[PDB]
Amino acid sequence: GTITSQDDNVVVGYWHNWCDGRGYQGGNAPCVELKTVNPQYNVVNISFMKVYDIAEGRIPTFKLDPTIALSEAEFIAQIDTLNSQGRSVLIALGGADAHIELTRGDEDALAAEIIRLTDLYGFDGLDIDLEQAAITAKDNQFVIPAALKMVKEHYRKTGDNFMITMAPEFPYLTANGAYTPYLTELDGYYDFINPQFYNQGGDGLWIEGVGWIAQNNDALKEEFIYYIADSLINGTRNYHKIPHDKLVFGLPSNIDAAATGYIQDPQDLYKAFDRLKAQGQPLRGVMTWSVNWDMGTDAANNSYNQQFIKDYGNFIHNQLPPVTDMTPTLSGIVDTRVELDSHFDPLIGITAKDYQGNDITADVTVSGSVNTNQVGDYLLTYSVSSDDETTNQPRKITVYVSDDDWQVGSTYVKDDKVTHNGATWTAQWWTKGEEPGTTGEWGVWR
Ligand code: NA
Numbered sequence: 001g002t003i004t005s006q007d008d009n010v011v012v013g014y015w016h017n018w019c020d021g022r023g024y025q026g027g028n029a030p031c032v033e034l035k036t037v038n039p040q041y042n043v044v045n046i047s048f049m050k051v052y053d054i055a056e057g058r059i060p061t062f063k064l065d066p067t068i069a070l071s072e073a074e075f076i077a078q079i080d081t082l083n084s085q086g087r088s089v090l091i092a093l094g095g096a097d098a099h100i101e102l103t104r105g106d107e108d109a110l111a112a113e114i115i116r117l118t119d120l121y122g123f124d125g126l127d128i129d130l131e132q133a134a135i136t137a138k139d140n141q142f143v144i145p146a147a148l149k150m151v152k153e154h155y156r157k158t159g160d161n162f163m164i165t166m167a168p169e170f171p172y173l174t175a176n177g178a179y180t181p182y183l184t185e186l187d188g189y190y191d192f193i194n195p196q197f198y199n200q201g202g203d204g205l206w207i208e209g210v211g212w213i214a215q216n217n218d219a220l221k222e223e224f225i226y227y228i229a230d231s232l233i234n235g236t237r238n239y240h241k242i243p244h245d246k247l248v249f250g251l252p253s254n255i256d257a258a259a260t261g262y263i264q265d266p267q268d269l270y271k272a273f274d275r276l277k278a279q280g281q282p283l284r285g286v287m288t289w290s291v292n293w294d295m296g297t298d299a300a301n302n303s304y305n306q307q308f309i310k311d312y313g314n315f316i317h318n319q320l321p322p323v324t325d326m327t328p329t330l331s332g333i334v335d336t337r338v339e340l341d342s343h344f345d346p347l348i349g350i351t352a353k354d355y356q357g358n359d360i361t362a363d364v365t366v367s368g369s370v371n372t373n374q375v376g377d378y379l380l381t382y383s384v385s386s387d388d389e390t391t392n393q394p395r396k397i398t399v400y401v402s403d404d405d406w407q408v409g410s411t412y413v414k415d416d417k418v419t420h421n422g423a424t425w426t427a428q429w430w431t432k433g434e435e436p437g438t439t440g441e442w443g444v445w446r
Pocket of ligand 1: 001002003004083122123124
């Protein structure tokens with residue numbers, strides 16, 4: 001099939017390529033045919049592309065579990081069905097026990113395999129759902145991005161939009177965080193991120209006024225959803241900036257489906273979306289583990305009568321067409337220290353991308369100066385415009401006084417370099433209280 005890109009808000013559902021999956025409270029996730037997946041999940045993610053046995057090498061692949069009771073011809077046509085209905089089928093790279101340990105160079109193999117599997121099942125793109133171990137493992141943080149980047153271009157030539165999604169667990173999203181490589185490298189290439197806001201129980205964030213909100217807390221679930229969201233969509237509270245148009249809220253479908261992080265009351269999520277909506281940053285949809293557990297049954301053989309999707313689906317669909325955050329991006333801006341009378345180039349280190357990936361570093365302006373000559377703290381503001389939008393972002397420069405600065409009492413020796421009234425005077429012999437500049441043409445100081 002051809003690549004069907006999802007372009008409106010999305011509900012996202014993982015599909016088990018296994019049967020009788022056991023839950024955290026002894027439920028069952030029966031397998032199910034694609035075409036049984038509730039039609040309001042307009043993004044189904046086939047789970048999982050991995051390495052089935054090491055004797056096929058490091059490059060992972062996908063094979064339908066015989067037990068599922070589906071011909072690969074059927075499977076393929078069920079995808080063509082969803083595709084035609086406007087929905088989208090994705091291959092999720094990873095899961096547990098995926099043994100995904102790529103070394104540098106494997107890019108081309110991964111890419112080619114991706115492209116093969118895609119052209120065969122009519123998949124519409126990939127979901128990076130690496131387990132913990134596999135985020136850092138060997139060269140993953142290089143290979144995987146590299147691969148997909150190539151893949152995306154392959155399809156860009158034809159005119160097709162290979163969908164890229166990721167599914168980091170939220171703690172990994174803290175700027176300077178494992179997934180930074182992925183997000184940074186794949187910027188403009190990824191369609192939208194669907195973090196897992198589950199299974200990191202105690203983890204969370206501190207909000208001024210509210211205190212310590214954690215994912216394991218169901219009294220403050222409204223907060224959690226609202227705050228982590230706001231942080232991510234704004235790059236605040238030590239979190240990477242995922243645009244709002246590209247953020248999707250990853251949730252258990254129910255209690256069997258995860259240890260922690262299932263929302264008891266939807267209102268919580270509803271309010272948070274209306275909140276984030278109110279502030280001008282509506283989210284792109286929700287995501288769950290999994291349609292199978294939603295279609296599943298609990299430890300009492302009671303059906304979870306596909307609740308989540310009932311909970312969330314009109315909710316999300318009745319929302320409004322996404323609007324693209326074409327703001328550009330400014331990386332490099334980190335508050336720095338500079339030595340008195342030292343040299344400082346503002347535009348060193350600074351890069352700027354647009355919304356689609358393109359580097360606009362050139363078009364970066366700077367407002368402010370940093371008078372190294374005088375001690376103090378100086379405030380630059382960087383600014384770049386593209387696609388009719390501007391991003392501005394402050395930067396603080398503190399001027400340190402340094403050892404070298406000439407002190408009266410300080411005994412300097414021959415060849416010593418000090419500083420005074422804006423200069424780096426050299427001594428020519430022992431000295432102790434001769435102000436550089438009061439000497440002469442042939443003075444202690446030079
Ligand atoms: Na397709």
